[PDB]
């Protein structure tokens, strides 16, 4: 939780959020759901599709709870990153999200494995959240 990030890159990982939360706008607009006051996915009910900078903390509560907390751990998630870069068709149902196409882009096997690690961890505080 209380991993020190850079003071660079701290509104650069805000839109490094917000380009995952328009990804969180669109993989949740891909099961073909729309804008809504509750959140119900089966009436066409989500309040997520706004962006990240934009919603406060209850509308983007979900992802900024889990985005921060992706990058905080890996920085220290026993390999190294660092500053490198900024914070850089299926028309949908009321917002087209797409700044860029990440299929240009490649990934890696040592970026899959950070990714497990910290699905390990998330999952183990679903487990703390499963408790009770």
């Given at each position: 939780s209380?991993?020190?990030l850079p003071p660079h890159l701290e509104r650069i990982r805000e839109k490094l959020?917000?380009?995952i939360h328009e990804l969180w706008v669109?993989?949740?607009i891909e099961l073909g759901w729309q804008?809504?006051?509750?959140?119900?996915?089966n009436k066409?009910?989500?309040?997520?599709l706004v962006e990240f900078s934009k919603l406060?903390?209850?509308?983007?509560?979900?992802?900024?709870?889990?985005?921060?907390?992706?990058?905080k751990t890996l920085l220290a998630l026993g390999c190294h990153v660092g500053i490198s870069d900024e914070h850089a068709y299926q028309l949908t149902s009321g917002?087209?999200?797409?700044?860029?196409?990440?299929?240009?882009?490649?990934?890696?096997?040592?970026?899959?494995?950070?990714?497990?690690?910290?699905a390990e961890n998330a999952h183990n505080v679903w487990a703390r959240d499963r408790i009770r």
């Open positions: 209380q991993i020190v959020a917000e380009n669109m993989n949740k804008y809504g006051p509750v959140r119900d996915d066409r009910q989500h309040p997520c406060p903390e209850q509308e983007r509560n979900y992802n900024l709870q889990m985005s921060l907390e992706t990058l917002y087209k999200p797409a700044p860029m196409d990440l299929s240009f882009i490649k990934l890696t096997p040592s970026q899959e494995a950070m990714v497990d690690k910290l």
